Design a protein around this motif. Structure first.
Motif, PDB file in Angstrom:
ATOM      1  N   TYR D  27      41.578-116.965  49.845  1.00 55.01           N
ATOM      2  CA  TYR D  27      41.328-116.162  51.038  1.00 55.01           C
ATOM      3  C   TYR D  27      39.867-116.421  51.426  1.00 55.01           C
ATOM      4  CZ  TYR D  27      40.433-112.285  54.164  1.00 55.01           C
ATOM      5  OH  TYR D  27      40.075-111.549  55.280  1.00 55.01           O
ATOM      6  N   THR D  28      39.672-116.847  52.685  1.00 52.93           N
ATOM      7  CA  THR D  28      38.337-117.130  53.201  1.00 52.93           C
ATOM      8  C   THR D  28      38.184-116.289  54.449  1.00 52.93           C
ATOM      9  OG1 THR D  28      38.304-119.398  52.305  1.00 52.93           O
ATOM     10  CG2 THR D  28      36.790-118.884  54.140  1.00 52.93           C
ATOM     11  N   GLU D  29      36.975-115.758  54.639  1.00 52.30           N
ATOM     12  CA  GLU D  29      36.676-114.920  55.786  1.00 52.30           C
ATOM     13  C   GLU D  29      35.286-115.256  56.314  1.00 52.30           C
ATOM     14  OE1 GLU D  29      37.574-110.742  55.200  1.00 52.30           O
ATOM     15  OE2 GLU D  29      35.459-110.278  55.725  1.00 52.30           O
ATOM     16  N   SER D  30      35.123-115.316  57.645  1.00 51.70           N
ATOM     17  CA  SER D  30      33.813-115.651  58.240  1.00 51.70           C
ATOM     18  C   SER D  30      33.409-114.631  59.323  1.00 51.70           C
ATOM     19  CB  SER D  30      33.857-117.075  58.807  1.00 51.70           C
ATOM     20  OG  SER D  30      32.761-117.246  59.684  1.00 51.70           O
ATOM     21  N   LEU D  31      32.129-114.234  59.333  1.00 52.26           N
ATOM     22  CA  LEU D  31      31.536-113.402  60.423  1.00 52.26           C
ATOM     23  C   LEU D  31      30.600-114.221  61.320  1.00 52.26           C
ATOM     24  CD1 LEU D  31      28.357-112.924  59.689  1.00 52.26           C
ATOM     25  CD2 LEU D  31      29.225-111.117  58.203  1.00 52.26           C
ATOM     26  N   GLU D  36      34.623-116.113  63.838  1.00 46.58           N
ATOM     27  CA  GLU D  36      35.056-114.829  63.266  1.00 46.58           C
ATOM     28  C   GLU D  36      36.529-114.908  62.956  1.00 46.58           C
ATOM     29  OE1 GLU D  36      33.830-115.182  66.374  1.00 46.58           O
ATOM     30  OE2 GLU D  36      31.851-114.198  66.453  1.00 46.58           O
ATOM     31  N   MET D  37      36.833-115.470  61.796  1.00 49.63           N
ATOM     32  CA  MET D  37      38.202-115.868  61.458  1.00 49.63           C
ATOM     33  C   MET D  37      38.501-115.694  59.966  1.00 49.63           C
ATOM     34  SD  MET D  37      37.732-120.077  61.487  1.00 49.63           S
ATOM     35  CE  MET D  37      39.505-120.315  61.388  1.00 49.63           C
ATOM     36  N   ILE D  39      40.995-117.738  56.853  1.00 49.01           N
ATOM     37  CA  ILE D  39      41.740-118.913  56.471  1.00 49.01           C
ATOM     38  C   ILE D  39      42.388-118.591  55.103  1.00 49.01           C
ATOM     39  CG2 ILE D  39      41.589-121.322  55.752  1.00 49.01           C
ATOM     40  CD1 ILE D  39      38.981-121.527  57.473  1.00 49.01           C
ATOM     41  N   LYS D  69      44.335-109.737  59.458  1.00 47.49           N
ATOM     42  CA  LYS D  69      43.278-110.074  58.502  1.00 47.49           C
ATOM     43  C   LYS D  69      43.193-109.031  57.392  1.00 47.49           C
ATOM     44  CE  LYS D  69      40.525-110.672  61.901  1.00 47.49           C
ATOM     45  NZ  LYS D  69      39.543-111.059  62.961  1.00 47.49           N
ATOM     46  N   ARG D  73      44.064-110.007  53.374  1.00 47.32           N
ATOM     47  CA  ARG D  73      43.089-109.675  52.295  1.00 47.32           C
ATOM     48  C   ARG D  73      43.760-108.861  51.202  1.00 47.32           C
ATOM     49  NH1 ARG D  73      38.319-106.496  54.601  1.00 47.32           N
ATOM     50  NH2 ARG D  73      40.086-105.097  54.741  1.00 47.32           N
TER      51      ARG D  73
END
Ligand SMILES: CC(=O)N[C@@H]1[C@@H](O[C@@H]2O[C@@H](C)[C@@H](O)[C@@H](O)[C@@H]2O)[C@H](O[C@@H]2O[C@H](CO)[C@H](O)[C@H](O[C@H]3O[C@H](CO)[C@H](O)[C@H](O)[C@H]3NC(C)=O)[C@H]2O[C@@H]2O[C@@H](C)[C@@H](O)[C@@H](O)[C@@H]2O)[C@@H](CO)O[C@@H]1O
Ligand SMILES: C[C@@H]1O[C@@H](O)[C@@H](O)[C@H](O)[C@@H]1O
Ligand SMILES: [Ca+2]
Ligand SMILES: [Ca+2]
Ligand SMILES: [Ca+2]
Ligand SMILES: [Ca+2]
Ligand SMILES: [Ca+2]
Ligand SMILES: [Ca+2]
Ligand SMILES: [Ca+2]
Ligand SMILES: [Ca+2]
Ligand SMILES: [Ca+2]
Ligand SMILES: [Ca+2]
Lengths: 103, 103, 103, 103, 103
Positions: D27-31, D36-37, D39, D69, D73
């Motif tokens: 689990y990857t998360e970006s701000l 802002e996604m 993956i 999202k 998670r």
């Protein structure tokens, strides 16, 4: 920008670090008007609040006040160890500004 | 500012304390129009509601009503012991104002 | 004010109670345009939706719809026993109005 | 209204169903601005995104994007088995439209 | 659109990838005016922040900042292994832009 809770707490006046190194003993929450707040206690008898939102708080703190209450509820339910709290000692119970968790 | 639930409850008319020292037996919620509410029960037969938001509630209370429903659901799912409830006793079911959890 | 899901359900036209006494077998959710919904199933082959939010839903129901989807996801993930569902039977799949959990 | 994810997916162009029957491997998360996604990956090498909100999404999809999202998670952290994903196959990585969980 | 955190991090100036492969050692959060932030640390001594929302952040980054703090708190509490962090190295402490979790 500070790197830990102690240095963050030192940027404010009328704040103090309490070192708990313990889980939360009790969690209290209120929806009653003018008392929309949380209170936590520890084994050692310490009581702390998350303040009712109010004119003393800037806009940016509103979401952070709601986050803090979320954090204390889930900390309580997971028996997470609370390392330190930064508090405003000019309120009774003392009012939480920051929390660290470590174990 | 009160330091515990009993002192908080005393700040309001038409309230009383219950000391359950028990987990929530059942959790009910509704999204039906004019009935957007939660109902909880205990093994001892006690039934409480979180009220449909309404005129009796001011604006600061809306977020807390939602938070209380979140708190009750996760307390139910974690089997968390409820220590006390502060409730309004002029409603049927008695309406939740505050909750304390301790074990 | 109703004190349980069965009395609450009877206040609406085109509703009925399903008594599942079982955990949710599957949980589906969608972000696709006009299909922003959830669907749950049970081992006995019952299928239910949370409706796409729309013009048939008053403002107070919008928050409650989102809560309900939160509820079903966490109920699914904790294998929480669902006691009863109150559902509108004039939709296909039948649409969730209320849920009770007890075990 | 569809009763399952396969029929929901077949209401849209440029979609297909992946049947994973497996937990989320990463689990990857970006701000980061304009990224802002989220993956996710699976052990079989499959990679999927929840897209950055934008003009291709109608206002009703904004909350559902956020919900998705949240769902990915918590699925990741609970090791919940993902049955199927409905994805847009004209995006790279393919973009999630819906998820079904069952185990 | 990138397919992994390393490629995402490479789209930005002033960023680097830290490979921790470790759970979060401490979690600190603050509601204090103008320090509405989070700080995490790892056993190896590394310290990272989630920045106070600010002029360096476009409006789309505001929901994602809130999400990232949610993610870090639940990761800390489940002892989730953090694989990589993409951070801005022109802030002190280094500021989180993205996170990947795998175990
Ligand atoms: C249930 C109850 O009655 N509890 C009280 C404690 O007070 C509660 O918790 C504190 C943190 C506050 O939020 C109170 O409003 C609340 O009722 C009480 O704790 C003391 O409370 C004082 C404020 O009223 C004060 O904060 C004190 O700490 C400071 O002052 C003392 C003076 O002896 C020392 O100088 C401390 O070093 C100082 N600490 C600072 C500045 O950080 C609180 O006492 C401390 O915390 C207690 C939990 C406990 O560990 C004490 O040994 C320690 O001194 C205590 C006092 O014993 O009684 C009840 O538990
Ligand atoms: C289903 C596929 O999975 C991975 O192999 C990706 O590189 C592709 O873009 C697609 O997302
Ligand atoms: Ca214990
Ligand atoms: Ca631990
Ligand atoms: Ca049990
Ligand atoms: Ca316990
Ligand atoms: Ca099981
Ligand atoms: Ca149980
Ligand atoms: Ca495992
Ligand atoms: Ca299971
Ligand atoms: Ca451990
Ligand atoms: Ca694991």
């Amino acid at each position: 920008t500070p790197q830990n809770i102690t240095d963050l707490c030192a940027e404010y006046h009328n704040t103090q670090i309490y070192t708990l190194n313990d889980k939360i003993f009790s969690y209290t929450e209120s929806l009653a008007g003018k008392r929309e707040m949380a209170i936590i206690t520890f084994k050692n008898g310490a009581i702390f609040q998350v303040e009712v939102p109010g004119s003393q708080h800037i806009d940016s703190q509103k979401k952070a006040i709601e986050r803090m209450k979320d954090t204390l509820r889930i900390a309580y339910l997971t028996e997470a160890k609370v390392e330190k709290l930064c508090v405003w000692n000019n309120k009774t119970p003392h009012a939480i500004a920051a929390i660290s968790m470590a174990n």
